Amino acid sequence: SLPIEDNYIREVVGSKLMECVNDAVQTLLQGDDKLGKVSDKSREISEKYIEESQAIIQELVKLTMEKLESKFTKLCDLETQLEM
Amino acid sequence: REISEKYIEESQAIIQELVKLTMEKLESKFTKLCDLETQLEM
Amino acid sequence: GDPDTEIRISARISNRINELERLPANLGTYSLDDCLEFITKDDLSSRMDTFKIKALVELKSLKLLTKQKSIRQKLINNVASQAHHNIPYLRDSPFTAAAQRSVQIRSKVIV
Amino acid sequence: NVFQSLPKETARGVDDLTRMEMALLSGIPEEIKWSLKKYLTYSNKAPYMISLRTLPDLLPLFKTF
Amino acid sequence: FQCVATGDNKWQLYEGNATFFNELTHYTLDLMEAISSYIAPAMKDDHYFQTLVSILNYTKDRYMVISILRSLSRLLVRSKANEESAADNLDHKTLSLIVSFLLLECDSELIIASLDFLYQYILPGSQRITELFKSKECSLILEATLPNLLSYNIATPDYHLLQKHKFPQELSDVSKVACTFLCLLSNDTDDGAGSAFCQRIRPLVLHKLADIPPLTLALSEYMENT
Amino acid sequence: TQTNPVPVTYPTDAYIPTYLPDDKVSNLADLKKLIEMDSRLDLYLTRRRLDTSI
Amino acid sequence: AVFDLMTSPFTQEEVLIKEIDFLKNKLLDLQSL
Amino acid sequence: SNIPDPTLPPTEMMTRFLHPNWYALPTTVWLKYGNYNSWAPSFNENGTVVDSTTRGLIWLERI
Amino acid sequence: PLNWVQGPAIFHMLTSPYTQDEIINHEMNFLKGRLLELQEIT
Amino acid sequence: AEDTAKLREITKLALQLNSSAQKYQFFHELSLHPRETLTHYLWSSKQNELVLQGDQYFNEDAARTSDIYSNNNNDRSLMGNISLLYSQGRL
Amino acid sequence: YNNVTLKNLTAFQLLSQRENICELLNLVESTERHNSIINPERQRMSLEEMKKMLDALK
Amino acid sequence: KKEFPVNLTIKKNVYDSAQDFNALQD
Numbered sequence: 001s002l003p004i005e006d007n008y009i010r011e012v013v014g015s016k017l018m019e020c021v022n023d024a025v026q027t028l029l030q031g032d033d034k035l036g037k038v039s040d041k042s043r044e045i046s047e048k049y050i051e052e053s054q055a056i057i058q059e060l061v062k063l064t065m066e067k068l069e070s071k072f073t074k075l076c077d078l079e080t081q082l083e084m
Numbered sequence: 085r086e087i088s089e090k091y092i093e094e095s096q097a098i099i100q101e102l103v104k105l106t107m108e109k110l111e112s113k114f115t116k117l118c119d120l121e122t123q124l125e126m
Numbered sequence: 127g128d129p130d131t132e133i134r135i136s137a138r139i140s141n142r143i144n145e146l147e148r149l150p151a152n153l154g155t156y157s158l159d160d161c162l163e164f165i166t167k168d169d170l171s172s173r174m175d176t177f178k179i180k181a182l183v184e185l186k187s188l189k190l191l192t193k194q195k196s197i198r199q200k201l202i203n204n205v206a207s208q209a210h211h212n213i214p215y216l217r218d219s220p221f222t223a224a225a226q227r228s229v230q231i232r233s234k235v236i237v
Numbered sequence: 238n239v240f241q242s243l244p245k246e247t248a249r250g251v252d253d254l255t256r257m258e259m260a261l262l263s264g265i266p267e268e269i270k271w272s273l274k275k276y277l278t279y280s281n282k283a284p285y286m287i288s289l290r291t292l293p294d295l296l297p298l299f300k301t302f
Numbered sequence: 303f304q305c306v307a308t309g310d311n312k313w314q315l316y317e318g319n320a321t322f323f324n325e326l327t328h329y330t331l332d333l334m335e336a337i338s339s340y341i342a343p344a345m346k347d348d349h350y351f352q353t354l355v356s357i358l359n360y361t362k363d364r365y366m367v368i369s370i371l372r373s374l375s376r377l378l379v380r381s382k383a384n385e386e387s388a389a390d391n392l393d394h395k396t397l398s399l400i401v402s403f404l405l406l407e408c409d410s411e412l413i414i415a416s417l418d419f420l421y422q423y424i425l426p427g428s429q430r431i432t433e434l435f436k437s438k439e440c441s442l443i444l445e446a447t448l449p450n451l452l453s454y455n456i457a458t459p460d461y462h463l464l465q466k467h468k469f470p471q472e473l474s475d476v477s478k479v480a481c482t483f484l485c486l487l488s489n490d491t492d493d494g495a496g497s498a499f500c501q502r503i504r505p506l507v508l509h510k511l512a513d514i515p516p517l518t519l520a521l522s523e524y525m526e527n528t
Numbered sequence: 529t530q531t532n533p534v535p536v537t538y539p540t541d542a543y544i545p546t547y548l549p550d551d552k553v554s555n556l557a558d559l560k561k562l563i564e565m566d567s568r569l570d571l572y573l574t575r576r577r578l579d580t581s582i
Numbered sequence: 583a584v585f586d587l588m589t590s591p592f593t594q595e596e597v598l599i600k601e602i603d604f605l606k607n608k609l610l611d612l613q614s615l
Numbered sequence: 616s617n618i619p620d621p622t623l624p625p626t627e628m629m630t631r632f633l634h635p636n637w638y639a640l641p642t643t644v645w646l647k648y649g650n651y652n653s654w655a656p657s658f659n660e661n662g663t664v665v666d667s668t669t670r671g672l673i674w675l676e677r678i
Numbered sequence: 679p680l681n682w683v684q685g686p687a688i689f690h691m692l693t694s695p696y697t698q699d700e701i702i703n704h705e706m707n708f709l710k711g712r713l714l715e716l717q718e719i720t
Numbered sequence: 721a722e723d724t725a726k727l728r729e730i731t732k733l734a735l736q737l738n739s740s741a742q743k744y745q746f747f748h749e750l751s752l753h754p755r756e757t758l759t760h761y762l763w764s765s766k767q768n769e770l771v772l773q774g775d776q777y778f779n780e781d782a783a784r785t786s787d788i789y790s791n792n793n794n795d796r797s798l799m800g801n802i803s804l805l806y807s808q809g810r811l
Numbered sequence: 812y813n814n815v816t817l818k819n820l821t822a823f824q825l826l827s828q829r830e831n832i833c834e835l836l837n838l839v840e841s842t843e844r845h846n847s848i849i850n851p852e853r854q855r856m857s858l859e860e861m862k863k864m865l866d867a868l869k
Numbered sequence: 870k871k872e873f874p875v876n877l878t879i880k881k882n883v884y885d886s887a888q889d890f891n892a893l894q895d
Binding site for chain 8: 723731732735736738739742774775778779780783784
C-alpha cells in the first residue's frame with residue numbers, strides 16, 4: 001500500500017433506468033389491486049407470441065416439403081434402375 | 085392482426101390437405117417399390 | 127497497455143531518479159524549532175535529518191518499483207486465481223456450481 | 238516437561254474425515270457446502286475411502302439431502 | 303422425465319428451470335445403468351422398463367441413448383423363455399429403431415450396444431426370433447447390414463489396384479460381436495424364421511470368408527449349421 | 529469415414545417445443561408427421577445406398 | 583498435491599495397495615486415450 | 616541487490632491474467648454423422664452447464 | 679479398530695479450468711509423478 | 721451441397737421457434753401467478769448484476785494504481801488473504 | 812466467439828430477462844423484431860407457394 | 870485518502886533555477 005508511481009499516472013493520464021424499473025416492481029409487489037392489472041396485461045402479450053409462433057410453424061411446413069421433394073426426385077430414379 | 089388472421093385461418097386447411105396428400109403419394113410409392121424388390125430378390 | 131504512453135511514464139521516473147541522485151550527501155535541515163534546545167558549539171541537535179531521510183525514501187522507493195510489481199502479481203494471481211471458492215455470490219450462481227460439479231464426474235466403468 | 242510428550246497425530250485438531258462427517262450432521266449451511274465439496278473431491282479421486290461397505294453410517298447422511 | 307418426453311399436459315416443464323432439470327436426469331440414469339444388473343428378474347408390467355422404453359424414442363443424446371441401451375441390455379439377462387416384459391412391452395416402434403442403428407457405418411459404440419441388446423433379446427429363441435424377423439423392415443435391414451458388418455474397418459484385399467496397374471490377419475471389435483450374433487442365430491432349428499434367414503445370407507458371407515481368413519475360425523457353428 | 533462421429537460447430541436439429549397449447553396451434557403434430565416421414569424415407573435411401581454394392 | 587490424515591480399518595500398506603490398484607486403472611484409461 | 620532498474624521493458628503487470636470469469640465452460644457437442652443420417656442421436660451432453668436449446672439460442676443471437 | 683494413516687495424494691491444481699482438454703496433460707504428469715514416487719515403496 | 725444449407729436454415733428456424741415459445745411461456749407463467757415470478761425477477765436480476773460486477777478491479781490501470789490495497793477496507797476481499805498466502809509460502 | 816464464458820452466460824440471461832420485463836411497462840418498442848419475422852407479404856408469398864404445390868400435386 | 874507526499878522543499882525549480890535554496894544549487 002505505497003503510492004510510488006501514482007503521481008506519474010495522474011500526470012500522463014489525466015443504469016438509472018433499470019433501478020427505476022426495480023423500484024416500480026417493488027411498488028407493484030405491495031398492493032393486490034395492480035396484480036390483476038398486470039395479469040390480463042400479461043395475458044394479451046402471450047397471445048402476441050402465439051400469433052408469432054404459428055407464423056414460424058407454417059414456415060417449417062413449407063421448408064420441409066421441398067427437401068422431401070428433393071427426396072422424391074431421387075427415389076423415382078430407383079424406380080427405373082433396380083428394375084433395370 | 086387481420087392480415088395475419090386472414091393468412092393464418094385459411095392456411096390450416098391447405099396444410100392438413102397437403103400433408104395428407106403427401107402421405108397418400110408416399111404410401112403408394114412405397115407399396116410399389118416394396119413389391120418390386122421381392123421380384124428383384126427372386 | 128499502449129506502449130506509446132508507457133515510455134512517456136517510464137521517462138519521467140528516470141528524470142526524478144537522476145535529479146535525486148545529484149543532491150549533495152551532506153544535506154541537512156535547520157528547522158525553526160531548534161531555538162528551544164539551546165545548541166552549543168558542539169551539541170548535535172535532534173532534528174538535523176528530517177530532509178535526508180525523506181530524500182532517500184523517494185530515491186529507494188523509486189528503485190523498488192519492480193519488486194512491488196512482482197509481489198502484486200503474486201498477490202492478484204493467487205486471489206483472483208481461485209475466485210469461485212472465496213467470493214460468496216459467485217460460488218452460489220447456477221452455472222459456476224454446475225461447472226464445478228460437472229468437472230468432478232468420474233468416468234463410467236464398462237461392465 | 239509435560240508439554241514435550243504430545244502425540245503428533247492428534248495435535249492438529251480432529252482429522253478431516255470426522256470433520257466432514259460432523260459438518261453435515263450439524264446445521265450450519267456453509268460448513269455443509271465445504272463438507273459436500275470435500276466429499277465430492279474424495280469421491281472422484283479416491284472412492285475406496287468413502288466406500289459404503291467401510292463406513293455404514295454414511296448413506297442416511299446423504300438420504301437426508 | 304417420461305412426462306417431459308411424452309408431452310403430457312400434466313406437469314409441463316418450465317423452461318427456465320430446464321438447466322436445473324437436465325443435469326438432474328443425467329445423474330439418475332447413471333444410477334439406473336448401474337443398479338439394473340441387480341433388478342435382473344424383470345417382471346411383466348414393470349415401470350422402469352416402460353419408462354426407459356418411452357425415453358429412448360425421445361432423446362437425441364448419443365451418451366443417453368447408449369446408457370438406455372446398456373440398461374435395457376443388462377435388465378433382460380436371466381429372463382425366461384415364456385413370459386416377461388420383452389415379449390409385449392416392446393411396441394415395435396422401438397425395436398424398429400434399435401435395429402436401424404446398425405445402418406450408421408461411422409459410429410461404432412452404438413453398433414456394439416445395439417448388437418448387444420439384440421443378442422440379449424434373442425437368447426430364448428422361441429417367441430423372440432419370430433418377433434424379431436416379423437417385420438418387412440426389421441427383418442430386411444439385417445439382410446444388408448449384418449454381412450457387411452463382418453468386414454467392418456478391416457483391410458480387405460482390394461482389386462482396384464489390380465485393375466489399375468496398367469490380408470488382414472486380424473478382425474475388428476464389432477466383427478467378433480457380429481460373428482457371435484450370427485452363430486447364435488444359426489442355432490434356430492426346426493426351420494422356423496431363423497434358419498430361413500441363415501440360408502439367405504450364406505451366398506454373400508461366403509464371399510467374405512474368401513477374403514478374411516480369421517472368418518474361418520469364427521463363423522464356425524454357422525458354417526456347421528450352413 | 530472415422531470410427532466416431534465428427535464434432536462440428538453449427539447446431540444440428542434442435543428440439544421442437546411440446547408445451548404450446550394445441551387448441552390454438554394444431555400444427556406441430558403435422559410437422560411431426562412430416563419429420564418422421566423424412567426419417568422413414570431417409571432410412572429407405574440409406575439402406576438402398578448400402579445394398580447397391582451388396 | 584495435498585495430503586491428509588484419517589482413520590481407517592486398513593494399514594498403511596493396504597492403502598498403498600489400493601492406490602496401486604486405482605492408479606494402474608486410471609493410467610491405462612488415460613494412456614489408452 | 617539483484618533488483619532491476621525501473622526503466623526496463625517489462626512494465627506490463629497484466630499480460631496472461633485470465634480471470635476465471637473468462638474461462639471456457641463445458642457445453643453441448645453437436646455431432647455430424649453423414650449426409651443421409653437424419654434419425655441418429657444428433658448431439659452429446661455429458662457434463663454440460665447449459666442445455667442444447669439455450670446453447671442453440673446463444674448461437675442464434677450471435678450469428 | 680483405529681489406524682492413523684496418511685491419506686492419498688489428491689491432485690488439487692493451482693489454477694482450475696473447466697474444460698477437460700486443459701486438464702489431461704497436468705493429470706498425466708500427476709499420475710506419472712505419483713506412481714513413480716510410490717513404486718519405490720514396494 | 722444445397723441440402724446442407726437447407727438443413728441449416730431449418731435448424732435456424734427451429735431455434736427461432738424455441739425462442740418464441742420460451743417468450744410465450746414466461747408471460748403465461750407470469751399471467752397465472754404473478755407474485756412468485758416477480759420476486760424471482762427481483763432476486764435473480766440483482767444476483768446477476770452482482771455476478772457481472774464481480775469483475776471490475778482487475779484492469780491494467782486499476783491495479784497499477786493504489787486504489788485497491790490502501791483504504792479499501794470497504795471491499796475487504798483482497799489484502800486479507802495476506803495472513804494466509806504468506807503462511808503457505810507462495811509470498 | 813466460438814466458446815462461452817460465465818460472463819457471456821450471465822450477460823445473455825440478464826439481457827433476455829430485462830427484455831421481458833420491459834414489455835409489460837411498454838418502454839421498449841420491439842416492432843422491428845416482430846415484423847421482420849412475421850413479414851405478412853412473405854407469409855402470403857409462402858401461402859401462394861403452398862397453393863401452387865396444391866395445384867401441381869392435383 | 871492516502872497520497873504520496875508532494876515533497877516540494879527537495880524539488881529544484883524548473884523555470885528560473887536561480888531562486889533555489891543555497892544547498893540545492895551547485
